[PDB]
Amino acid sequence: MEYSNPVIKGFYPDPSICRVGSDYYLVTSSFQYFPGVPIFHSTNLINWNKIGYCLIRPSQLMLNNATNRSGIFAPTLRYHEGIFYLITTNVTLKKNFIVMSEDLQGEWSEPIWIDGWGGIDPSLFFDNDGKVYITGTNDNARGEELGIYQAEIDLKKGSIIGERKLIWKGTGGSYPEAPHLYKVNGWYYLLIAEGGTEYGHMVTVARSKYPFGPFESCPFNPILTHRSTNHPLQAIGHADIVQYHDGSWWAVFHGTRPISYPPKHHLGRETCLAPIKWTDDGWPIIGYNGRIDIKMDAGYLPVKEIIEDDFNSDIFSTDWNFIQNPRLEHYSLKGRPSWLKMRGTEKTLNDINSPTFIGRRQEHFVCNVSTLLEFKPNQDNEEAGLTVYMNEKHHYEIALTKKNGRINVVLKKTVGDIQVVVNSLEYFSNTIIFSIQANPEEYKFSFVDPNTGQTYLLGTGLTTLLSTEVAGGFTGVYFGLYATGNGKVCTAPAFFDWFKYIPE
Amino acid sequence: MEYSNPVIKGFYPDPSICRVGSDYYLVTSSFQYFPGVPIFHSTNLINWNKIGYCLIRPSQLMLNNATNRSGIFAPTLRYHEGIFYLITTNVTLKKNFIVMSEDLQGEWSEPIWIDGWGGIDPSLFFDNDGKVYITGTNDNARGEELGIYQAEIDLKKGSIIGERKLIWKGTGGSYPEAPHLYKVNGWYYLLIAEGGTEYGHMVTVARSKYPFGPFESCPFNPILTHRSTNHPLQAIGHADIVQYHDGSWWAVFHGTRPISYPPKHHLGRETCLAPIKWTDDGWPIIGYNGRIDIKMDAGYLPVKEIIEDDFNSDIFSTDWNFIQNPRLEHYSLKGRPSWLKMRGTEKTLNDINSPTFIGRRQEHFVCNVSTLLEFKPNQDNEEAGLTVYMNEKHHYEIALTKKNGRINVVLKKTVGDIQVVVNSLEYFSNTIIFSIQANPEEYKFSFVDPNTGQTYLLGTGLTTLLSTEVAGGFTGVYFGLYATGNGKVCTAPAFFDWFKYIPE
Numbered sequence A, B: 001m002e003y004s005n006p007v008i009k010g011f012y013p014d015p016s017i018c019r020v021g022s023d024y025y026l027v028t029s030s031f032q033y034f035p036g037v038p039i040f041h042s043t044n045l046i047n048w049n050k051i052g053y054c055l056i057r058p059s060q061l062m063l064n065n066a067t068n069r070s071g072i073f074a075p076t077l078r079y080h081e082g083i084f085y086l087i088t089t090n091v092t093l094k095k096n097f098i099v100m101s102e103d104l105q106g107e108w109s110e111p112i113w114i115d116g117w118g119g120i121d122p123s124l125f126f127d128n129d130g131k132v133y134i135t136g137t138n139d140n141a142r143g144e145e146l147g148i149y150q151a152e153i154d155l156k157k158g159s160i161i162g163e164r165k166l167i168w169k170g171t172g173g174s175y176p177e178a179p180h181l182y183k184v185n186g187w188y189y190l191l192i193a194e195g196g197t198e199y200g201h202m203v204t205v206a207r208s209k210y211p212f213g214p215f216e217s218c219p220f221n222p223i224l225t226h227r228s229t230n231h232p233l234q235a236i237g238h239a240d241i242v243q244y245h246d247g248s249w250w251a252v253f254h255g256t257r258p259i260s261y262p263p264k265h266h267l268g269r270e271t272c273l274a275p276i277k278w279t280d281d282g283w284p285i286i287g288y289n290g291r292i293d294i295k296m297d298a299g300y301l302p303v304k305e306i307i308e309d310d311f312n313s314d315i316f317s318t319d320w321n322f323i324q325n326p327r328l329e330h331y332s333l334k335g336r337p338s339w340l341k342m343r344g345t346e347k348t349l350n351d352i353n354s355p356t357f358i359g360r361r362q363e364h365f366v367c368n369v370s371t372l373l374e375f376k377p378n379q380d381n382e383e384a385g386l387t388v389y390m391n392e393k394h395h396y397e398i399a400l401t402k403k404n405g406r407i408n409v410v411l412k413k414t415v416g417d418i419q420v421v422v423n424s425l426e427y428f429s430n431t432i433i434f435s436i437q438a439n440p441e442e443y444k445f446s447f448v449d450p451n452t453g454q455t456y457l458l459g460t461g462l463t464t465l466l467s468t469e470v471a472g473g474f475t476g477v478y479f480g481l482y483a484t485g486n487g488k489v490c491t492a493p494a495f496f497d498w499f500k501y502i503p504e
Ligand SMILES: OC[C@@H]1O[C@H](O)[C@H](O)[C@H]1O
Pocket: A013, A014, A029, A073, A074, A120, A121, A177, A178, A193, A197, A238, A474
């Protein structure tokens, strides 16, 4: 039996996994998007269902001034004696913290801030003797030696017990990070990432008889990498290990699916799965001797996407994210029941600090995305539409607006410093359907006059100008609904009737 | 004593070196640019002077349909018994060939085509017993096994002697290439590149008692790489070894100087230098145990850029290149003596097949480039100016043109599918000076009214939107003079009085 990588497609980086009984839970990083830290459930490690998010209240998730280069970095999920612990860094705050839950169907606790614990990629390990360890990276603010640092932790207080110790510098790759500590068959294993989360990414491992070392580097490090290969999966690493309930061992990790030359990726880093074998001499081997594939052998794992939101519910679906903390008063499912009402502010998609926007990840190279908008702009600056969005300097949008007192449909692009109106046509109806067809190379932007059903191709745009390599940051493309007054508050409401996401 | 890498700055990839007495000669790849294969001279390996080019006649260099993804790939330079041999691939023709010279101050021979020898990166080795070997890569057209292939060669006939043999697959990195064979202290060394010429690039070496193997992989391969590091020099490899006349050993190779995040480079791949040490057990060590730096120890090498062309000469300087084979009738230094006259055709900078353009490499992150143009366009399509050019889809230009019968100075950009006029101002003089200030992050485009000396900032543009990572291909930015009729022949001549390139 076979499965395909990635197992969670689209922008789902830094996967951390946690087993409870015969069920599995997984979390990913979310940067500037709100709510933060998607959480998934699976029974077979292959098929994952999003249960919701971990950070859903402003007290848990302060994203003022966050961008796709900041906000929430790698989260780690652990379970002990009926309690889930989620530990992560808000890089904008420069703070590490824990939230807790006894029930993933309910909400998580207020943050327990870990004072004086710096760096990114905090992790927790519950040792068999009852001791709890926090492991993490060098603190940049301080200017510490690159490497992996560890201490005992008191979980109630969120405070370190005893001394913080450097435990391993790694094999010598850049950015030693993503540390997780495990104990298997009497050995402590320290699993890390090196090389940076781009084309040099790799997984390395060390072991010791003691939780604080000394750690011996695995003689066949790195144990997983696609560096220096032209494989369709690239930038592989940031791994977390699980033992399935049949006793077999597996790792989750992220990778990219770049296209073009030099390689460029626009779907973000995506969650992948590979089996682990243990050597006779007590080392883990990931995948096919340190390499993985798109099609993989499922071993004994039990093998087994059209999304349509008509805005009938007064609760937002779990597909939606906002750019930073939403200004709640600017979105309404109740103002006009069965529609989403959005109120544009002075902020545009070129601005980092909460523009009026709600969006969902692009999770497929080939898909069709559409929405119906009612919008009657009162003034020339006023605009609402559908965006393909990577960050504040890299986005395309098809929108209704006004120019010299005439309503126009426009295709607009921001790429770096370039802000261009690509095409503009007069439009004569109160509602419009926007439709975007995505393929690996380009987006095609069309609009439909709803009453006639007549379709019009407005223009196209390249996927590669939205790629991470071009745009910067750590994220993937989103499709979003937005409104703006382009420097002034928008005086006209935007009403979106529905949103459809149809993969090939 | 110290030197700085790169030793030849700007677009100078795939360096191959050749010693004759106490003097040294070096060649680099040139892709679609004409003339092709720059050749340099040095006495100390650090300071290189361009002597000219190897491929200067249309018979030697057929570039119709060549782009920055094709044309001339890696060249290798060798010397034997008073004759220089340059061997390379024209990827557009899909042909390998040799040109010969007994005097680098004169021209090279007609091509000797090596029939049936495919792949890229051909190399020559003159064995101590008089035998001559050609070494190269797998032939893609055929669909051969990746690896390094070798045969004996008859140099007069350009034909293989005996059998072509696979000699090494490399260590397992992608694209095993750049092979060179050497014989040192009774061992044959086969030096190659693996990992691709991007962030996974590395140098590996194998040895044998016999020229055709079996080859043993060096136990500490790779012997040079910056993969998985955040060093300012990246993508290092494609090395060629020389023994200096004091007996010390050195390698030349290329690397990039990327900026931003993810890393992006716009100066092309640049030629670097590092020392070699030989181990007691007979293996070469490059640089500081397989890593190199911007500042390097010069050992015993004897340690030791404003370019102004006023077009007084009726011969083009060695700084200038054209896009493919120039249409000679469209450039003149004699029509108006002391000026360069250019005649624009229907072809624009967006077209691959010889637009009217002459250009020189950007060789510094910080520099000021300028020219004076006399241009009186007769029609709206007609345009001449100064370009910052990476390839046909990635270039910025400041130019004089006509719109609705008014002369305007414009800043124009092509980035992927985006073609935009960024700024446009009416202009009232027959001549104009264009001035571009480059820094690592951006180009600033100004014009000067020559008689008044008044300067006007027209706009700016990002370096990263011209980077190789964004644009594609294998080259670096050029600054160019150009003219076009934008779909029609230009009916007005363009006269450029001078060109100045002033590094910081
Ligand atoms: O995803 C953001 C950062 O990149 C690396 O994957 C690191 O482990 C993580 O915190």
